[PDB]
């Protein structure tokens, strides 16, 4: 089909921690006699990979893009491929019109509490302009592993005005633990937060 090219942004995890972040480029839609070029960082070991699959695609990565990305500088990734004479162009920078997530941790409903088996904590992150968000959970000061909670994908909210996104996450915990007075937190990671993460902590006492 019609050959297409797009750039993929760096990992929100890597950027929010403040460590080195990989910036990736891929070729969708022929043998890999391919040579990539990058604009903003000159002679910085732009690494390639094998041709992963239907029709093949060659992946190109570029390390240490964090400071320029967060500065807002624009990354161009021109890729030469044998099938054509002249190459394709793809542009990607850090998003504008940023909004901070509003984070709400909602207590378990009366219905579940009464049944006194498992009760459900609902984390709602809402009103944030770049779709990309991290959601993590604490019980006490212990971080729960990913496998112990369910997080939905960030989806666009209704508005005629500004384009915001919302995400939900659901942690199921023993009625016992909730009734002992244990704390439960959801931590929301986002580019627009001045302290990288926002934390909301709920207990039965409030």
């Amino acid at each position: 089909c019609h050959p297409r090219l797009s750039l993929h942004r760096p990992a929100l995890e890597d950027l929010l921690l403040g460590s080195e972040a990989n910036l990736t480029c891929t070729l969708t839609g022929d043998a890999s006699g391919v040579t990539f070029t990058w604009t903003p960082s000159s002679g910085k070991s732009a690494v390639q990979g094998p041709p992963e699959r239907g029709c093949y695609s060659v992946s190109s990565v570029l390390p240490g893009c964090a400071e320029p990305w967060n500065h807002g500088k624009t990354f161009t990734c021109t890729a030469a491929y044998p099938e054509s004479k002249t190459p394709l162009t793809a542009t990607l920078s850090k998003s504008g019109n940023t909004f901070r997530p509003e984070v709400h941790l909602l207590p378990p409903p009366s219905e579940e509490l009464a049944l006194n088996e498992l009760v459900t904590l609902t984390c709602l992150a809402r009103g944030f302009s770049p779709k990309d968000v991290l959601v993590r959970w604490l019980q006490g000061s212990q971080e729960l592993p990913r496998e112990k909670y369910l997080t939905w994908a960030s989806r666009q909210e209704p508005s005629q005005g500004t384009t915001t996104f919302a995400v939900t996450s659901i942690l199921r915990v023993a009625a016992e633990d909730w009734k002992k007075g244990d704390t439960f937190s959801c931590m929301v990671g986002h580019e627009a937060l001045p302290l990288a993460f926002t934390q909301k902590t709920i207990d039965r006492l409030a």
Partner: antibody
Amino acid sequence: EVQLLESGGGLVQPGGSLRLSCAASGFTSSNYLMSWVRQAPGKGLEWVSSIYHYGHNAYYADSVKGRFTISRDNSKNTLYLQMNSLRAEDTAVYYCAKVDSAYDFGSWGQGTLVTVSS
Amino acid sequence: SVLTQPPSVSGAPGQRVTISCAGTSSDIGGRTYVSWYQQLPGTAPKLLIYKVTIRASGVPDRFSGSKSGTSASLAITGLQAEDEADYYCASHRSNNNIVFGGGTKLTVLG
């Protein structure tokens, strides 16, 4: 094995500022609740500051509020306490501590003595 | 403020002794985030008990913790001269502080 090495301690004049560092090993200080806890010579343990997992969301004792700042630098895996407008009452061994599951100081450094004196 | 501990307790060898820790509804009352630390002279504090009742690894069963309303207490059985140390309780408080007790100097008689 988890290890915490405090450094930065020494003499500072009243009203002066000091920076304590705390190098973490055998764990990632970003992935845990990290704290500074202080003990004036002869006296009891006083929690100073906490910094929660991943972010820069900090809490402070009121004895220390508007003066001290708990920082974290993930590239070096070190915890900081910026101390300003220091007083005789801030003379203490400063411990950095890793919190486990239940707001419990599971792993402690050896401590660094800040002396506030003319 | 500070969680209220007795400045000292004492016991004979082989005795059971208790160290009390009196807090508020914002800390020990309603929650189970009460920890106990042993501080031998010179050395940094060592966690004995966390979550009111749970021993840290290495800590013998001689050491045990309990809670009742707004106060918790550490309990030591088969008391040995080895147990001579300062003992601090701590607790999470509603204001996202960790509040320590005044500390208790434990003496073994005879």
